């Protein structure tokens, strides 16, 4: 790959249901809790954690690379709070890709403070097909995912060193 | 099934997944099901993932279809609450050899 063009499938706006705004203090900047820029971390409005639908539908003409994440918590609690409801899932599918992960609740130890886990997995999207995500809860969402532009080959040379 | 046929046979197996609860329970009756395959060499358990997906074939259901080859004189056992495709066959080996899978277009002159 040798460019690629982000373009936004998932709107943080135009999804009306939950609350989007959540990030914590791993992702800080200078003491400022932040996340993932093109995530979109998905928790309940009003005791309400309702049905947690999505589609997208491929015009763009080259492939996509899209990502999503699972939530696991440390506690019972932890996930009481957020998504409200227990026994919760995650569901992505396409033409060719169908999974369903189901989350994790354990006592982790302490890796920048953290108990709670996040799990990635990434597909690529062809042509003219559809992406559907449904979820109870846990779900972590992409705002957008990748077009390839420049198809070619080049490398990842792994340096310390900097450009000149 | 035990195996008596004195040669190794493959053997392939499915489970359904559908789009709605709806589909579970018009087909299955209950729900929380599974589907268990083993033999000597293995044992698998499945849990049908109901979701929405695409038509495919006019279908967002899907089935996932899966194999173990079973070796002479041991026993393969199925156990399903729902969701079960199961095998009415397996196919024994009859011969074996240097042999392979071409890929062309064309057809046998
Ligand atoms: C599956 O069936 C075969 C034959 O029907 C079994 O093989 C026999 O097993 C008995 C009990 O151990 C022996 O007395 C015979 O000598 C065996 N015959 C042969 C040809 O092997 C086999 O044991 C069965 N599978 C299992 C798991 O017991
Ligand atoms: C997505 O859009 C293209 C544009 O014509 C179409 O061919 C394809 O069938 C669409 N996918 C769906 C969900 O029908």
């Known amino acids: 790959?040798?460019?690629?063009?982000?373009?936004?499938?998932?709107?943080?706006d135009r999804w009306?249901?939950?609350?989007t705004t959540g990030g914590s203090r791993a992702?800080?900047?200078?003491?400022?809790?932040?996340?993932?820029?093109?995530?979109?971390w998905l928790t309940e409005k009003g005791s309400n954690?309702?049905?947690?639908?999505?589609?997208?539908?491929?015009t763009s003409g080259e492939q996509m690379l899209?990502?999503?994440?699972?939530?696991?918590?440390?506690?019972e609690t932890e996930?009481?709070?957020?998504?409200?409801?227990?026994?919760?899932?995650?569901?992505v599918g396409t033409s060719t890709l169908n999974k369903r992960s189901t989350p994790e609740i354990a006592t982790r130890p302490k890796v920048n403070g953290q108990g709670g886990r996040m799990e990635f997995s990434w597909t690529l999207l062809d042509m003219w097909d559809t992406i559907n995500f449904e979820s109870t809860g846990n779900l972590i969402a992409?705002?957008?995912?990748?077009?390839?532009?420049?198809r070619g080959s080049s490398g990842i040379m792994k340096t310390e060193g900097t450009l000149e």
């Open 1 to 12: 790959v040798k460019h690629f063009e982000k373009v936004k499938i998932l709107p943080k």
């Open 16 to 19: 009306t249901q939950h609350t």
């Open 27 to 40: 992702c800080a900047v200078s003491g400022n809790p932040s996340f993932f820029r093109n995530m979109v």
């Open 49 to 58: 954690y309702p049905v947690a639908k999505g589609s997208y539908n491929n």
């Open 66 to 75: 899209i990502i999503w994440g699972v939530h696991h918590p440390n506690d």
């Open 79 to 91: 996930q009481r709070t957020l998504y409200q409801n227990v026994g919760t899932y995650v569901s």
């Open 142 to 150: 992409p705002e957008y995912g990748f077009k390839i532009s420049k």
